[PDB]
Design a protein around this nucleic acid. Structure first.
Lengths: 106, 125, 168, 187, 155
RNA sequence: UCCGCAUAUGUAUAAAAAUAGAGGUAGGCUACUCUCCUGUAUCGUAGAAGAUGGGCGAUGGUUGAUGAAACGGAAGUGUUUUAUUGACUUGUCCAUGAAAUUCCAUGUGCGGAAUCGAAUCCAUUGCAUACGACUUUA
RNA sequence: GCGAAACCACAGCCUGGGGAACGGGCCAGG
RNA sequence: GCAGAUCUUGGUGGAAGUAGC
RNA sequence: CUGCCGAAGUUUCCGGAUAGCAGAAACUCAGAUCAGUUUUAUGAGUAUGUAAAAUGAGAGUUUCUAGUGGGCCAUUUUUGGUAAGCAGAACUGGCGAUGCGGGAUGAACCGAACGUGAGGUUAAGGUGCCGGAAUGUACGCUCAUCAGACGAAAAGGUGUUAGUUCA
RNA sequence: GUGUUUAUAGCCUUGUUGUAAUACGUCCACUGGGGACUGAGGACUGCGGCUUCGUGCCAAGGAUGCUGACAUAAUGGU
């Protein structure tokens, strides 16, 4: 089944936050394989999605997606800042996100 | 022991802008800094810290504080180039660099040949 | 990093002093502004020459003529501490005068918990004779047979699969 | 770098605090972590040092002695255990003494940022958690220190069988001309 | 000090393996396979020599290195000629039955060259014999008779 | 047992051991060489989500389905050995089909009954005892 | 069987600290 | 133009099916 | 209900007349003045003062007309001290009418003073985990069995690290 | 191991071989990409640049152009 997955695995770590104030509009995403802020420049502007399933079979489907884009790197270790169309729920801390390769400049 | 910080021992630079370039210690400034030089023109004579290099098993006899040109003469005389390359350590490094240069079409070709190689599966009963 | 500046200064000429004397010091500072301030402070406390009545006539950074040759530098320093009066002399082996002074500052700030303003250098000299070397550590570094293993090797990608070799 | 669903860590030679902080961050990152050989963890400091630390802890609570319970306590203090996120992250950690049968046949990784040989200065006294636990109440040290040889002997036999089996393909590799005919790609 | 090597001439012992900080210094008289885990000194088997490299060693490490050199010599001495430990016993007005018993008439019963490769163990055994012959609530002159090791020399 | 109702993306990787280093090494306890110097590796990876055929090379690698025997105790729950029965076989060479998606959007649960056991109450009992609740016996 | 009244800002497990009690109400823990 | 006035009037709670008769 | 302005919280005599702070009205006035500011030099005694330069701002008013007539944190200079702390003056600002980032938490400590938002960048603090951010680089000290991170203190250290002097 | 002076290595110093190169500092009204947020205003005027001149054109007093998906859905609110 290794003829698929055009995307890259990622994890939703947290929102942008200070010690005591959280900003849910921007989320901190750890793209796996990206290990520094210079490698995070490749994934800037790429589409990222959160894919989950819900009980109702609305649209005749069991899966729904929240889309987003990668805006800028966060820190030195390769984490990025992502803004989603809808703010990611706080329950999705440590959940998985998919980073496509489009819009591609390669 | 096989690797001693010594005058004339060949080292491999693993940190900095000269990563992956062979060099030979010419003097010991201190226990934390060593003076190295390489015959190739891309490597200027410089003082580097011991934490930025790894120590190779090749020892080639140099006088203390030898100049750059005489280092090159000794390097060519003792054929350090193609002596380091003969060891499997350099072959593994060279293969890693070559494998990193492969493009998508080359990667597809490698998968085809390695599948042609794997279908061999001949083992004596 | 530190830079070695030679600073020449003199007092403003007046009717009493048609032509004044030139006073030159070689002092280390990260930038020229620090060197000029240190030069005036040294002049004020050595020659009692005020900055208001004085002016800097020249300043030039000095590069090490032989940065590719190992050398031994002896530094005479003055320590200002709780007592405020100490004379010390240290010997450092390196390739440039700047590195030795930086090493001295790191050593004293670590061991003695000093500061840049308190520490003042009377002189830095190059020990060109092995017999002139006083410290035993530097004498070892000049022995004919430097032979020691690699120290402090210590060598994201967390969760390494195999145990490290951390050896030859 | 990359994550797996379950990560098995061989805690032999790993410092308690360094490994716990790495594990706690991985647990909050959304990963299931299994730490085996929890009795082989190391703590910087002499035997008497952490002895008085644990003896003072006994003076204070449910005093646990087992090495995994020591490690589980260290990881828990590095988690937001007062919230649902911290509790959920805690439940993804499985710390055990030794290597149980479900895990001795699975690959075990190590954390270089927590290894004693790469973090402690040579010549520094250290206290093993298993030895430290043995005198403070833990009574299963001897039986687990005896069973490990049985696991090691079986595992060593498996490695020899695997190595002997691998020799056939390794010889067959260079035997096939196509291995070197198109080896210009670095493979 | 950059280097503090301590060369020690190797004896005619059977084995001198010091792998994994375990100096299995075997010998003809005895196999003094004592692990060299006391000090972190690198041992170099330079033929008929044992260079105890103590490079970048501290004062405490150097003191341990010097003790290790004596231990190596002591192990070699035991591996070559052992260590005889002559023991002398003096009887008071009440002789001490020997399995120590009747110590000044003591009804309680406790438990002379002594050749041995392990000189430390032989000396420790001699101390145990001296510790066994311990006077309690008795004058020193009255308890002058006791078991004291006469001499200890290589057998 | 009947009746009614609601209807993760390759999930691939198993000696131990220390750095005052180990692993394994011919030979017959060695000797000495080799390897590291992380997995950027190894295993797998083609097919209108993976088609239909002609095949060919090898006459065999993957597996499904059963019939299986061994091993695995620490929490064995899995490691093989297979006997076959069928297939894909990317090992390789050809012929067809893919499209106007004509620029991204992706048996299981509940409520009822007819049943089979068991337990409590129960004949009970003080063994227990404000009452609960407990222990024996119908 | 009949049948009150007082009272009621509101919840309510402990160890320390929060300087003006801080506590029960905050912070750090069990 | 109300949330306060140990506010006024009316209605209704927890205490409580408690103290008790 | 919203918007705008906005104190004083204390000199002086002595419940007030005040003044002062904050507004309204009636003005005139840049070819003119004003200033919790720095100056030039000399006057007097580095400070202090002076008339006339730099910088900024347009300023001076006259009348009447609400509210207040305390303290706290203390700093600094400072007097007396007195086992020693401590107390007494002035000064300085802040809190008092002030939310916000940090300081584990915090009425007075470090930053910063506020319309509703988007993006960027910082301050003070920080980047092992809790916790956003380098288990960063380089050079040193220490192993504390009551480390360190925040008077029993004199000394003792066969506890040390570096150096200075005599040698 | 003792002393040597290029030996069958060379090291340092000195002037010196054709000049340099490089690093650092600084500047270009020199230039090539990647990402994100914003689109206020609403005829024409203006300042400019191209243009032989242009009811000319332009990145010049604030976004336009080309497409795709949906009414029994898409999108948001409670």
């Amino acid at each position: 089944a290794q003829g698929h997955r055009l995307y890259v695995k990622a994890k939703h770590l947290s929102f942008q936050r200070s010690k005591h104030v959280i900003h849910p509009g921007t989320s901190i995403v750890k793209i796996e394989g990206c290990d520094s802020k210079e490698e995070a420049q490749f994934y800037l502007g790429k589409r990222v999605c959160y894919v989950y399933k819900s009980s109702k079979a609305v649209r005749g489907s069991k899966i729904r997606v929240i889309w987003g884009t990668i805006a800028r790197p966060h820190g030195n270790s390769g984490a990025v800042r992502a803004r989603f169309v809808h703010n990611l729920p706080a329950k999705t801390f440590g959940s998985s996100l998919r980073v496509m390769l489009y819009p591609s400049n390669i | 022991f096989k690797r001693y910080v010594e005058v004339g021992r060949v080292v491999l630079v693993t940190k900095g802008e000269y990563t992956g370039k062979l060099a030979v210690i010419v003097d010991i400034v201190d226990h934390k800094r060593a003076l190295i030089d390489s015959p190739c023109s891309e490597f200027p004579r410089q003082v580097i810290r011991y934490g930025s290099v790894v120590l190779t098993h090749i020892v080639m006899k140099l006088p203390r504080g030898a100049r750059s040109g005489i280092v090159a003469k000794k390097w060519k005389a003792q054929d350090v180039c193609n002596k380091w390359a003969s060891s499997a350590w350099a072959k593994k490094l060279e293969a890693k660099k070559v494998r990193s240069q492969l493009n998508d079409f080359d990667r597809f070709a490698v998968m085809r040949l390695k599948k042609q190689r794997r279908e061999q599966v001949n083992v004596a009963v | 990093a530190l830079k070695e500046y030679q600073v020449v200064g003199r007092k403003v000429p007046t009717e009493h002093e048609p032509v004044p004397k030139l006073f030159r010091m070689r002092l280390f500072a990260p930038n020229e502004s620090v060197a000029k301030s240190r030069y005036w402070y040294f002049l004020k406390m050595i020659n009692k020459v005020k900055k208001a009545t004085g002016e800097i006539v020249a300043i030039n950074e000095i590069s090490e003529p032989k940065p590719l040759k190992a050398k031994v530098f002896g530094i005479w320093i003055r320590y200002d501490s709780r007592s405020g009066t100490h004379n010390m002399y240290k010997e450092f082996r390196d390739t440039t005068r700047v590195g030795a002074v930086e090493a001295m500052y790191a050593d004293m700030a670590a061991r003695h918990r000093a500061r840049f303003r308190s520490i003042r250098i009377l002189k830095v000299v190059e020990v060109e004779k092995k017999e002139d070397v006083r410290r035993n550590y530097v004498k070892q570094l000049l022995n004919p047979h430097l032979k020691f293993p690699l120290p402090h090797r210590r060598t994201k990608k967390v969760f390494a699969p195999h145990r490290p070799s951390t050896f030859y | 770098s990359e994550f797996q669903k379950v990560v098995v860590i061989d805690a032999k030679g790993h410092l308690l605090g360094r490994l716990a902080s790495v594990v706690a961050k991985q647990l909050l990152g959304g990963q299931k972590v299994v730490v085996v050989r929890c009795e082989e963890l190391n703590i910087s400091g002499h035997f008497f040092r952490n002895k008085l630390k644990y003896l003072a802890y006994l003076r204070k609570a449910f005093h646990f002695r087992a090495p995994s319970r020591i490690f589980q306590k260290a990881v828990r203090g590095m988690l937001p255990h007062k919230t649902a996120r911290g509790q959920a992250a805690l439940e993804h950690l499985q710390a055990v003494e030794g290597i149980p049968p479900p895990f001795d046949k699975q690959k075990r990784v190590v954390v270089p940022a927590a290894l004693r040989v790469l973090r402690l200065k040579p010549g520094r006294k250290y206290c093993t958690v298993g030895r430290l636990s043995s005198e403070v109440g833990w009574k299963y040290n001897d039986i687990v220190a005896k069973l490990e040889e049985r696991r090691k002997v079986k595992s060593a036999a498996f490695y020899q069988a695997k190595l002997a089996k691998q020799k056939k393909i390794a010889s067959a590799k260079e035997a096939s001309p196509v291995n070197q005919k198109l080896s210009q790609f670095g493979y | 000090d950059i280097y503090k090597d301590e060369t020690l001439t190797i004896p005619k012992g059977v084995t001198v393996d010091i792998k994994a900080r375990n100096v299995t210094v075997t010998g003809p008289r005895g196999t003094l396979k004592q692990n060299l885990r006391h000090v972190d000194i690198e041992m170099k088997k330079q033929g008929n020599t044992i260079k105890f490299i103590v490079w970048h060693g501290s004062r405490k490490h150097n003191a341990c290195i010097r003790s290790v050199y004596s231990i190596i010599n002591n192990m070699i001495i035991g591996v070559t000629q052992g260590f005889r430990y002559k023991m002398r016993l003096v009887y008071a007005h009440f002789p001490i039955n020997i399995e120590i018993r009747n110590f000044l008439g003591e009804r309680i019963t406790r438990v002379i060259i002594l050749e041995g490769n392990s000189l430390e163990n032989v000396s420790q055994s001699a101390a145990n014999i001296k510790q066994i012959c311990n006077v309690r609530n008795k004058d020193i002159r009255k308890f002058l008779d006791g078991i004291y090791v006469s001499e200890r020399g290589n057998i």
